[PDB]
Design a protein around this motif. Structure first.
Motif, short mmCIF file in Angstrom:
data_model
loop_
_atom_site.label_atom_id
_atom_site.label_comp_id
_atom_site.label_asym_id
_atom_site.label_seq_id
_atom_site.Cartn_x
_atom_site.Cartn_y
_atom_site.Cartn_z
N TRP A 113 40.39 35.00 50.95
CA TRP A 113 41.23 34.01 51.63
C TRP A 113 40.46 32.69 51.71
CZ3 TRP A 113 42.71 34.26 57.54
CH2 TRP A 113 43.55 33.18 57.84
N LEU A 114 40.85 31.73 50.88
CA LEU A 114 40.25 30.40 50.88
C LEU A 114 41.36 29.38 51.05
CD1 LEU A 114 37.79 30.96 47.92
CD2 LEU A 114 37.20 30.86 50.35
N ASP A 115 41.24 28.53 52.08
CA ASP A 115 42.28 27.56 52.45
C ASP A 115 43.55 28.36 52.71
OD1 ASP A 115 40.63 25.20 52.35
OD2 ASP A 115 40.63 25.43 50.16
N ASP A 116 44.70 27.97 52.15
CA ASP A 116 45.95 28.70 52.33
C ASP A 116 46.30 29.56 51.12
OD1 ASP A 116 46.44 26.54 50.68
OD2 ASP A 116 48.42 26.11 51.53
N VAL A 117 45.30 30.11 50.43
CA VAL A 117 45.51 30.92 49.24
C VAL A 117 44.66 32.18 49.35
CG1 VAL A 117 45.30 31.05 46.73
CG2 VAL A 117 46.07 28.94 47.80
N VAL A 118 45.25 33.31 48.96
CA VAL A 118 44.56 34.60 48.93
C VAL A 118 44.43 35.04 47.48
CG1 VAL A 118 44.56 36.98 49.71
CG2 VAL A 118 45.41 35.18 51.22
N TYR A 119 43.20 35.28 47.04
CA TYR A 119 42.93 35.71 45.68
C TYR A 119 42.64 37.20 45.67
CZ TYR A 119 42.27 30.67 45.07
OH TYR A 119 42.44 29.30 45.06
N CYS A 120 43.26 37.92 44.75
CA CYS A 120 43.12 39.37 44.65
C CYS A 120 43.45 39.79 43.23
CB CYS A 120 44.04 40.08 45.66
SG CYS A 120 45.79 40.13 45.20
N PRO A 121 43.05 41.00 42.82
CA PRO A 121 43.44 41.48 41.49
C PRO A 121 44.95 41.61 41.37
CG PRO A 121 41.59 42.73 42.33
CD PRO A 121 42.08 41.90 43.47
N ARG A 122 45.46 41.21 40.20
CA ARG A 122 46.90 41.21 39.99
C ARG A 122 47.48 42.61 39.87
NH1 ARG A 122 48.06 39.48 33.63
NH2 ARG A 122 46.58 40.97 32.70
N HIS A 123 46.65 43.63 39.65
CA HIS A 123 47.18 44.98 39.51
C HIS A 123 47.61 45.59 40.84
CE1 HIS A 123 43.85 47.21 41.27
NE2 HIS A 123 42.99 46.50 40.55
N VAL A 124 47.54 44.83 41.94
CA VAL A 124 48.07 45.33 43.20
C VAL A 124 49.59 45.45 43.12
CG1 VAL A 124 48.25 43.03 44.23
CG2 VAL A 124 47.97 45.05 45.70
N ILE A 125 50.23 44.65 42.27
CA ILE A 125 51.67 44.73 42.07
C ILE A 125 52.08 45.87 41.15
CG2 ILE A 125 51.61 42.24 42.26
CD1 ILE A 125 52.65 42.15 39.34
N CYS A 126 51.12 46.55 40.53
CA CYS A 126 51.45 47.67 39.66
C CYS A 126 52.01 48.83 40.46
CB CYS A 126 50.21 48.13 38.89
SG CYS A 126 49.68 47.04 37.57
N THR A 127 52.81 49.58 39.79
CA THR A 127 53.37 50.81 40.37
C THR A 127 52.45 51.98 39.97
OG1 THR A 127 54.77 51.87 38.79
CG2 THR A 127 55.39 49.64 39.33
N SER A 128 52.62 53.18 40.52
CA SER A 128 51.77 54.26 39.95
C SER A 128 52.25 54.47 38.51
CB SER A 128 51.81 55.51 40.80
OG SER A 128 50.68 56.34 40.58
N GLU A 129 53.56 54.56 38.36
CA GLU A 129 54.31 54.82 37.10
C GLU A 129 54.38 53.61 36.14
OE1 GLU A 129 54.97 55.70 40.33
OE2 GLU A 129 54.33 57.69 39.67
N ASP A 130 53.82 52.46 36.45
CA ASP A 130 53.97 51.36 35.49
C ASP A 130 52.69 50.68 35.02
OD1 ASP A 130 56.46 51.07 34.26
OD2 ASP A 130 57.34 50.44 36.15
N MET A 131 51.57 51.19 35.47
CA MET A 131 50.28 50.63 35.06
C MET A 131 49.79 51.35 33.80
SD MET A 131 46.87 49.71 37.33
CE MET A 131 45.20 49.66 36.67
N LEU A 132 50.67 51.36 32.79
CA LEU A 132 50.38 51.93 31.47
C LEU A 132 50.42 50.89 30.36
CD1 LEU A 132 53.17 52.39 29.46
CD2 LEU A 132 53.78 53.65 31.55
N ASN A 133 51.14 49.80 30.56
CA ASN A 133 51.23 48.61 29.73
C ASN A 133 52.09 47.62 30.52
OD1 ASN A 133 53.30 47.26 27.45
ND2 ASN A 133 51.12 47.10 26.90
N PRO A 134 51.62 47.15 31.67
CA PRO A 134 52.46 46.28 32.50
C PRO A 134 52.58 44.89 31.90
CG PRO A 134 50.30 46.49 33.47
CD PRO A 134 50.36 47.50 32.36
N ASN A 135 53.71 44.25 32.19
CA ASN A 135 53.99 42.88 31.76
C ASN A 135 53.95 41.98 32.99
OD1 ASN A 135 56.80 40.95 30.70
ND2 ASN A 135 54.69 40.73 29.98
N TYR A 136 52.73 41.83 33.52
CA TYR A 136 52.50 41.36 34.89
C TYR A 136 53.38 40.20 35.32
CZ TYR A 136 48.45 44.38 35.46
OH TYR A 136 47.62 45.48 35.60
N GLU A 137 53.51 39.17 34.48
CA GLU A 137 54.24 37.98 34.90
C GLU A 137 55.73 38.26 35.09
OE1 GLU A 137 55.08 33.48 33.55
OE2 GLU A 137 53.29 34.35 32.61
N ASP A 138 56.30 39.16 34.30
CA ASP A 138 57.70 39.54 34.52
C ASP A 138 57.86 40.35 35.80
OD1 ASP A 138 60.53 39.63 33.40
OD2 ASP A 138 60.10 41.78 33.57
#
Ligand SMILES: O[C@H]1C[C@H]2CC[C@@H](C1)N2Cc1ccccc1
Ligand SMILES: O[C@H]1C[C@H]2CC[C@@H](C1)N2Cc1ccccc1
Lengths: 299, 304
Positions: A30-55
């Motif tokens: 958490w720096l200023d008003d932004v939180v930086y973290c790995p993008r794979h937190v949005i992955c599902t158990s069932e979808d982290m096999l070839n995710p299309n993160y931005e979609d």
């Protein structure tokens, strides 16, 4: 006396928060008003096999992201992606935000890691970027979202974020701008670290540190060429020495009176003949996680 | 497994950084620990270089007043309102309670137990490291002489247990100090006289806990099928400068022995074989050295 230290983690502790997306919980910076973290937190158990993160990202609402700072929950008001890090625009700026930079390091350079779990700091350790681009550490050395950093007179240089733990007791991640260190992907897929090597430039810096403190039994009268040493060091899986590295060791060569290629001849004999039951700075093994500046700066 | 490639970690030093201050008496300057309205520091700050051979701390202190001590926290000066001596720590009472004060206790540790040290020069934290309490009552730290006043600590549930304060360099490069009540660890005095730490040994109970940690993670190459008596093991271990194992140490390793199904004396026989053969290339939990600065308390908690 010579013991390896990590930077005081106080400035980084004030930035660690807990980020939860669905069932996945990990650490965020958490720096200023932004939180930086790995993008794979949005992955599902069932979808982290070839995710299309931005979609997947452009359709998750702000309310899907749960951000906790102690017992304050930060309201997510926006989210964007830069490479492999997720950026969460929050409604509150961190008042404990230190003077900081985003930097990228290179293999052999050292930094401190603040191990965290559920956004709460557990411990801190000093480490180096292995030549294979991994950081040695266990599941008990911090989970996803833990950050690596250096401190330069009040300024925190964030250089690493933990993303995944490899089965060989090492972890890999990115810089704070989302670019992985090494040939790794933020996917649940068969990933292995390449054959690791010794950071030669750090060993010589550590050998210089022994000279400065009067441990000089290993000094010999011989000099070697840069390639004759590199031909030998590589045979022992020691990362080859470049002319850049010779230049970085310049101040230690001038301060001790030992040319880099002189110390290289000492290290060369150490490789081919061992230490013969003797020690250096109280260690029976050669240390390779001390950069030249780490020595210049502690010694 | 869970602990593969494990690295010693120091506790996060944030809560201690907010307590470090600079204490100056004349030309001598060192670090102080500011908790509530009291600053703790080594009492030899009132010594000059000439006093340090045979200092009379009572005579030197009785001649000091509150305005003789300069205490600075960052950019603020702290007026001192009181001063008293408790063994080898100086206690300076200030008019300002530390708003940064964390939850803290004063605890004395035993040889073999581990803690974090925040190395500080003139009140500013330089770095943090994790160390163990050597059997000879020293600690192997890294300094510049300004580190006098640096404190050792553990953190449990955001409560900071302070256990060490640095006072001396011994001629062998290791450090000697006191607890936060001023009592030295070991036979050392805050006197710049001929002091020799007895030969250091290996903390055997920590090595056995480290080996039990390896078994829990599936690292079993070093195990052998032999057992040994407690006396036969101590007879061998001491010749390698390893600490004699007591029945207390055997009881402490109980939960580790029950979790792995390997008797403590069985583990001792494997360690005995490791000492005669050495590792020499092979690694245990990713380390090419026998770790002796990780306590059984830490192993048991991290492997429930
Ligand atoms: O990934 C690591 C860094 C680089 C690239 C491969 C290897 C391991 N390194 C080069 C090398 C080769 C031979 C001998 C020594 C080093
Ligand atoms: O001061 C430390 C604690 C005790 C007493 C001296 C030594 C170091 N320890 C005993 C000992 C000596 C040799 C071999 C094994 C144990």
């Amino acid at each position: 006396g010579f013991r390896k230290m990590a930077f005081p983690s106080g400035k980084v502790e004030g930035c660690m928060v807990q980020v939860t997306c669905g069932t996945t919980t990990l650490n965020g910076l958490w720096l200023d008003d932004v939180v930086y973290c790995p993008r794979h937190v949005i992955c599902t158990s069932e979808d982290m096999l070839n995710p299309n993160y931005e979609d997947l990202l452009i359709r998750k609402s702000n309310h899907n992201f749960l951000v906790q700072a102690g017992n304050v929950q930060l309201r997510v008001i926006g989210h964007s992606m830069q490479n492999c890090v997720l950026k969460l625009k929050v409604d509150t700026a961190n008042p404990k935000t230190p003077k900081y930079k985003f930097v990228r390091i290179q293999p052999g350079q050292t930094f401190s890691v603040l191990a965290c779990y559920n956004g709460s700091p557990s411990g801190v350790y000093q480490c180096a970027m292995r030549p294979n681009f991994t950081i040695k550490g266990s599941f008990l050395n911090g989970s996803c979202g833990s950050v690596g950093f250096n401190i330069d007179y009040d300024c925190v240089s964030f250089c690493y974020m933990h993303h995944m733990e490899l089965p060989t007791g090492v972890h890999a991640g990115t810089d704070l701008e989302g670019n992985f260190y090494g040939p790794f992907v933020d996917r649940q897929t068969a990933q292995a670290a390449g054959t690791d090597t010794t950071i030669t430039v750090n060993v010589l810096a550590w050998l210089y540190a022994a000279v400065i403190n009067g441990d000089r039994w290993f000094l010999n009268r011989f000099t070697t060429t840069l390639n004759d040493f590199n031909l030998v060091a590589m045979k022992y899986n020691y990362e080859p020495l470049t002319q850049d590295h010779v230049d970085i060791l310049g101040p230690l060569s001038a301060q001790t009176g030992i040319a880099v290629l002189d110390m290289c001849a000492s290290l060369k004999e150490l490789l081919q003949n061992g230490m013969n039951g003797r020690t250096i700075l109280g260690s029976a093994l050669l240390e390779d996680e001390f950069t030249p500046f780490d020595v210049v700066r502690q010694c």
